[PDB]
Symmetry: D2
Subunit: 122 residues, 4 copies
C-alpha cells in the first residue's frame, strides 16, 4: 500500500508517460508523449526529470517533475500526489504550469498557462 | 548575450538558490534555501533539479525545476524564463505551484497554492 | 444553440450553484452551496456575482464570477467557458483562485490556492 | 483604518482601474484600462464587478472581481487582499486568471493564463 510513481501512465487528455526507478535521493527520470499540442510543431516524446517527497515514508507522496519539450521552446512543470483511491487503485492528481517563450520582458505577463491532469496506470 | 541559469540567485522573498552546470541536454541540479515557511519545522537547504529548454538555443531560454523539500512533505515546482533586464542584469521571472500533502483524495482540491518569484544574481 | 449560464448547476465536488437571469450587459447574480470546506465553521449558502462576455455574441461564451463566502474570510473567483459537450449537454469548464486572509503582508505569498471545477446541469 | 477598495489605482504593468463605493453587502463596480493586450483590437475601458469580504470586521478584506473585456472575447478574474502598510498607504496584492475563448472543448486545456498584479493608489 505505497502509491509508487514508477511505471506507465495515461492522463485525461490521452497523453502517456513513463517513469523509471526512484533512486536514493527521491529522483526519477521519464518520458512524456502528449496527445495535444497547438502549433505545426509535430509532437515527439520528450524527457522528464523529477523528484518525489519521501518525508515521513509517506504512503501517498507528493512529487513534481519538469517536461523538457523537444518540439517546443516552452517548458511544463507538473506537481501532485499519488493516491490509492476507493478501489485500491492508483491515481496521480496533478496541476501544471506551461511556460511559453516571449521575446521581451514586457510580455512576461502573458507567458504562463495553468491546468490540471489526472493520471492512471496504463 | 546568453542568459545562463548557472550560479547563485536571491528572490523577492529573500530565498537563495544555487544552480550548477547546465549539461548538453539542459539538465541541472542545485540547492534551495527558502527564507519563508509556515511549519513549526526548521527550514533546511533542499535539493533542486530541473532543465532548461534548448530548442533553438534561445538567448533567454525557458526552464523548470522541482524543489524536494527536506523539512516538509510538500513539493514546489518553478517554471520561468531567464531575461536580460532593461538595466543589463540577468533576471529569472518565474511562477510556482506548491503541492501540500493531504490524507484523502477527497481533499485534493485544497492542496495546491500558486505564486510568483523574481530572481536576481547574488 | 447558445450555452447559457442561467439555471441550476452541480460540480465534480458535489457543490451546487444557481445563476439568475443574465442582463443585456452580461451581468448575473447567484448563490453557491459548496460541498467542501476545511473550516470548523458550518458551510452556508453564499452569494455570487459575475459577468458573461458578450463580444461577438458567442454561443460558447467566457465568463467569471466572485463568491463572497458567508462563513469564511476567504474569497473565491471562477473563470471559464460554457460549451456544448460532445453529447450535446451544456457544461461549464472552470478554473478558480481561492484567496485566504493573512494577517501580515509578509505572508501574502502563501495565500492563494488554484484548482478546476466542471459544472453540469442539475 | 480599514483598507478600502474605493478609488483610482494603477498596477505594475501600467494598467489603471477605478472602483466605486462598496455597498453594505460588500459589492462594488468599477472600470479597468489595461496598458497591455495581444491583438490589433483597440483597448477600450471595460467594466468590472466584484465583492469584498469583511466577515468579523477585517481591516484588510479579501476580495475578487471580474473584468468584462469590451474588446476581447476573453474574461479575467482577480482575487486578493487589501493591505494597509504602516504609513497608511494601501496596496492590493492580486492574482488573476485570464480565460481565452476556444472553439472546441478539446482545446480547453490551453485556455487559462495566470499571473499577478500589485495595485497602488493613483
Ligand atoms: C498511449 O498509449 C495508448 C494505449 O497504448 C495508445 O492507444 C495511445 O495512442 C497512446 N497515446 C499517445 C502516444 O499519446
Ligand atoms: C543567502 O546567501 C547570502 C550570502 O551569499 C546570505 O547573506 C543570506 O543570509 C542567505 N539567505 C538565506 C535565506 O539563506
Ligand atoms: C445540491 O442539490 C441537490 C438536489 O437538487 C441535493 O441533492 C444536494 O444535496 C445539494 N448539495 C449541496 C451541497 O447543497
Ligand atoms: C493610467 O494613468 C496615468 C495617469 O493618468 C497615465 O499616465 C497612464 O497613461 C494611464 N495608463 C493607461 C493604460 O490608461
Amino acid at each position: 500500500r505505497k502509491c509508487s510513481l514508477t511505471g506507465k501512465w495515461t492522463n485525461d487528455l490521452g497523453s502517456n508517460m513513463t517513469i523509471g526507478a526512484v533512486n536514493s535521493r527521491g529522483e526519477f527520470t521519464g518520458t512524456y508523449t502528449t496527445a495535444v499540442t497547438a502549433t505545426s510543431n509535430e509532437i515527439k516524446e520528450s524527457p522528464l526529470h523529477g523528484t518525489q517527497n519521501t518525508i515521513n515514508k509517506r504512503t501517498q507522496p507528493t512529487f513534481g517533475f519538469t517536461v523538457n519539450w523537444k518540439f517546443s521552446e516552452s517548458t511544463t512543470v507538473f506537481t501532485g500526489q499519488c493516491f490509492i483511491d476507493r478501489n485500491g487503485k492508483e491515481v496521480l492528481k496533478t496541476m501544471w504550469l506551461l511556460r511559453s517563450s516571449v521575446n521581451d520582458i514586457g510580455d512576461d505577463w502573458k507567458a504562463t498557462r495553468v491546468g490540471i491532469n489526472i493520471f492512471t496506470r496504463l
